[PDB]
Amino acid sequence: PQAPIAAYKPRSNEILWDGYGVPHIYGVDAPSAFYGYGWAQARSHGDNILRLYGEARGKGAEYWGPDYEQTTVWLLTNGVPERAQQWYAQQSPDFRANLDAFAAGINAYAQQNPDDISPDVRQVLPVSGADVVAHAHRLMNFLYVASPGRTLGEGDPPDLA
Amino acid sequence: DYFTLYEAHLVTPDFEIYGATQIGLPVIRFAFNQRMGITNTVNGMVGATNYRLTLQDGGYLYDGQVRPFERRQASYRLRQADGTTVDKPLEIRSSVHGPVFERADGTAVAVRVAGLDRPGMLEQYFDMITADSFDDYEAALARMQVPTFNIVYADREGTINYSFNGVAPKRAEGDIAFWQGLVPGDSSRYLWTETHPLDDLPRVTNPPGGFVQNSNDPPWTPTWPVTYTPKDFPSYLAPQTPHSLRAQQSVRLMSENDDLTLERFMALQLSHRAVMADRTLPDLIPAALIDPDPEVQAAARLLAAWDREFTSDSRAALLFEEWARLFAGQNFAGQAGFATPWSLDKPVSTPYGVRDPKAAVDQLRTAIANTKRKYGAIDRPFGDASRMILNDVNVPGAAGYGNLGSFRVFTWSDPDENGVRTPVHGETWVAMIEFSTPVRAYGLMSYGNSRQPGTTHYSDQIERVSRADFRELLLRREQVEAAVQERTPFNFKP
Amino acid sequence: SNSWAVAPGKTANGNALLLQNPHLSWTT
Numbered sequence A: 001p002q003a004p005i006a007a008y009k010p011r012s013n014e015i016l017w018d019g020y021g022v023p024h025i026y027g028v029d030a031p032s033a034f035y036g037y038g039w040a041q042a043r044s045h046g047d048n049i050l051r052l053y054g055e056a057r058g059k060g061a062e063y064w065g066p067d068y069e070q071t072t073v074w075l076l077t078n079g080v081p082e083r084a085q086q087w088y089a090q091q092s093p094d095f096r097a098n099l100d101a102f103a104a105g106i107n108a109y110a111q112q113n114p115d116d117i118s119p120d121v122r123q124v125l126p127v128s129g130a131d132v133v134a135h136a137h138r139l140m141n142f143l144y145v146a147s148p149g150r151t152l153g154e155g156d157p158p159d160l161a
Numbered sequence B: 001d002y003f004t005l006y007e008a009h010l011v012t013p014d015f016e017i018y019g020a021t022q023i024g025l026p027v028i029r030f031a032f033n034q035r036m037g038i039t040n041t042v043n044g045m046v047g048a049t050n051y052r053l054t055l056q057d058g059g060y061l062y063d064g065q066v067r068p069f070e071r072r073q074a075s076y077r078l079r080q081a082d083g084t085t086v087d088k089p090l091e092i093r094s095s096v097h098g099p100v101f102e103r104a105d106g107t108a109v110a111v112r113v114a115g116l117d118r119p120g121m122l123e124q125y126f127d128m129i130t131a132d133s134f135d136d137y138e139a140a141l142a143r144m145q146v147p148t149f150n151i152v153y154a155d156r157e158g159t160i161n162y163s164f165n166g167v168a169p170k171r172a173e174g175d176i177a178f179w180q181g182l183v184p185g186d187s188s189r190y191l192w193t194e195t196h197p198l199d200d201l202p203r204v205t206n207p208p209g210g211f212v213q214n215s216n217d218p219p220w221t222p223t224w225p226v227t228y229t230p231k232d233f234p235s236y237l238a239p240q241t242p243h244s245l246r247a248q249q250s251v252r253l254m255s256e257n258d259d260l261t262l263e264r265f266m267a268l269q270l271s272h273r274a275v276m277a278d279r280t281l282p283d284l285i286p287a288a289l290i291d292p293d294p295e296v297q298a299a300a301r302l303l304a305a306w307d308r309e310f311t312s313d314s315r316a317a318l319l320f321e322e323w324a325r326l327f328a329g330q331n332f333a334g335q336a337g338f339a340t341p342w343s344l345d346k347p348v349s350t351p352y353g354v355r356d357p358k359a360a361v362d363q364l365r366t367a368i369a370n371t372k373r374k375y376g377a378i379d380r381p382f383g384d385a386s387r388m389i390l391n392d393v394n395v396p397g398a399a400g401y402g403n404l405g406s407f408r409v410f411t412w413s414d415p416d417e418n419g420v421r422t423p424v425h426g427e428t429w430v431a432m433i434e435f436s437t438p439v440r441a442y443g444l445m446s447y448g449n450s451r452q453p454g455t456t457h458y459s460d461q462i463e464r465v466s467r468a469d470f471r472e473l474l475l476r477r478e479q480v481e482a483a484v485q486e487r488t489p490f491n492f493k494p
Numbered sequence C: 001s002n003s004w005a006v007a008p009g010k011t012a013n014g015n016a017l018l019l020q021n022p023h024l025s026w027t028t
Helices: A030-056 A060-064 A066-077 A080-089 A093-112 A119-124 A129-145 A148-152 B121-129 B134-141 B176-180 B245-255 B262-269 B275-289 B294-305 B317-327 B357-375 B462-466 B477-483
Strands: A014-017 A023-026 B005-011 B016-022 B030-032 B036-041 B048-052 B059-062 B065-067 B070-079 B085-094 B100-102 B108-113 B150-155 B160-164 B182-184 B203-205 B211-214 B338-340 B352-354 B387-390 B393-396 B410-412 B423-427 B429-434 B440-445 B486-489 C002-006 C017-021 C023-025
Touching (some): A023 A030, A030 A119, A030 A129, A060 A066, A060 A119, A060 B070, A066 A080, A066 A129, A066 A148, A093 A129, B005 B440, B030 B429, B030 C017, B036 B121, B036 C002, B121 B134, B150 B211, B150 C002, B150 C017, B160 B211, B160 C002, B211 B245, B245 B275, B262 B440, B262 C002, B262 C017, B275 B294, B275 B317, B275 B352, B294 B357, B387 B462, B393 B462
Parallel strands (some): B048 B182
Antiparallel strands (some): A014 A023, A014 B486, B016 B030, B030 B036, B036 B150, B059 B065, B100 B108, B150 B160, B160 B203, B338 B352, B410 B423, B429 B440, B429 C017, C002 C017
């Protein structure tokens, strides 16, 4: 039959980054790997991650003003932030700990490297497991499946680069 | 912002995942490892309904009676130009269907989204990509917590699978177009409450043709020969519209080739054929050569000598695009110009031909003018106008628009004042994996692995993309140790 | 986006092949 190659068994927690900035995250258990993964993402994409999490809280208008307001109304009206709190509580305990670790990795990157976080997303920190669930919820159900454009009778895709 | 991908590799004593995912997601949607891997494409699963309400006496009409709205007074803060915030009131009205929005034209619309009771999306993906076997993969998929996407799977035991995945409401009538528009909001006739389980959805496993595929086409030729037809499923799951020329190429590239190597598989992915030129130039060229305008004749001879590939050195491709914009619309998806219409009975060789050659030559006349205005000439090299530019890296483009038949896609922008255009959409994360022992995998990310200011890892892959020079993906510890340039120890205490 | 999976019988070496190929915005 032929078995696969022997799985590697990490003995310490470390990110080995290669020459293209790809993180190879080794964790001694699941929560450690998810923490490493959040650290890495914060390093490579921290600012836009924090912005996105802020929006998924329904706090885009509060944090960043009128350009974020229609998304705020869409998400609050569709009850997205509160639903994310519920989905978060409804996680299995083990997976919840993975989500908590991921969020803790982001917070930790930011805390250790505050120079790398843009001023106007600093107010988003700290992030939580529930923020992670919320961003995924808004992406899947309220961008991919149900877009504001199709409900409101608008059209052209997002426009903020 | 939302759509940006990131490449990573996670290893613990109990699992290993490699691949790409949308930033902010804690699981890898485009994942593989030593055992298995998946990918995704958009299927547009119609997971929500927008209902047109009839407003009457401060409520809405429903099954013959006026019914009051669920109303709550919420609020949010709005940041002012001077850094303060003000409290803004926000009424959240709701009907039995769901939350109510008012369009600018006065239409009251209630949106009803399925699967709001599915908290396990992230965990489902996580269990899918760390599955020990295909049966475990399928049991995870079957939970129905991932509300959309075509999802394709392969593994080292030899199994492949395509699934038209998502959470689809059960309805008793109406086709996809009906349920995509405004459904009447005045009757329980159209109020769905249940959704389809996985075995109600189009799926294919280890089919006789020995491959599966999806290139955003409706799921009716996921393989060849097909294993089902549209009448085997409810008419509201997916459109029965003409398959794009890209999707037609997808089927051909897989079906017509055999004894595939990873190398050949990779070469086939670079396919950048102007299939639309194959379908139209046979009728267009002779019609155009009849025209008295010497510029149209010259345009016709330039197109006739073209090998119909979107290569960097092509002198005809820009002109051909501009003609196609008119003949088949700005999206290149229009069908009214063809002589022989698309048919599911000939799904990779229709539509075909030019219905009205004389009108098409008039379109060519206009396209010549459009081409000179956009690009400075009718015969500018494709890859001199089409460039991939990140920071100070500026490299020649190749391949192009999917609806013209290019498999590898670069949705070129409108040109600037010098005729230079760059990709707004297309190839991002591209990986090809063979589930040998050990696995062998290659990939590239067009726009690098970081977007933080001053990073050296935003523009460092695009030159390799311009030459299809793929990175070997490094999953084995010893490979990783040979390549490491930075080590970040960490420790996590809950 | 594109997606391919190829069964062992259609390959020379006898191992399945997978293409991951999402098409998304560049947002340059």
